[PDB]
Amino acid sequence: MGKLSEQLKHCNGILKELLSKKHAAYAWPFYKPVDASALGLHDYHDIIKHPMDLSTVKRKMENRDYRDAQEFAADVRLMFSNCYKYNPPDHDVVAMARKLQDVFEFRYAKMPD
Numbered sequence: 001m002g003k004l005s006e007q008l009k010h011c012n013g014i015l016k017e018l019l020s021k022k023h024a025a026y027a028w029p030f031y032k033p034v035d036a037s038a039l040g041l042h043d044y045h046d047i048i049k050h051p052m053d054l055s056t057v058k059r060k061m062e063n064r065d066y067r068d069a070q071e072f073a074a075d076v077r078l079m080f081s082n083c084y085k086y087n088p089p090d091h092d093v094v095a096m097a098r099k100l101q102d103v104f105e106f107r108y109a110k111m112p113d
């Protein structure tokens, strides 16, 4: 009934969409934590102090970690910012981040209030 719960439902709906087949062509790099060692990215954790990805956001939502929409949004945007920080701006993953963030921002803006 409460507004914070309603706003978190909206957040959970967004999260579901971001993880859906509809956006999978560009969302997939953000599905799981960056495995720096496996990708040979030995500077990743020197550059990115707070890694974030959609499975972590999903775990946090499932664990009732997010107390409000703003906290949820902060993690999703952190995930995109990390991508923009680490990768040169002309890399394919940055194009995919921008597209997925477009999905996120436009639906997030329809927050019930």
Ligand SMILES: CC(=O)N1c2ccccc2N(Cc2ccccc2C(=O)O)C[C@@H]1C1CC1
Pocket: 028, 029, 030, 033, 034, 035, 039, 041, 044, 082, 083, 086, 087, 092, 093, 096
């Ligand atoms: C989330 C994130 O920033 N990353 C990411 C995360 C998980 C999986 C892949 C990636 N990609 C790689 C990648 C994406 C898309 C298309 C091709 C490639 C390619 O291999 O050239 C890059 C980057 C890595 C930080 C460099």
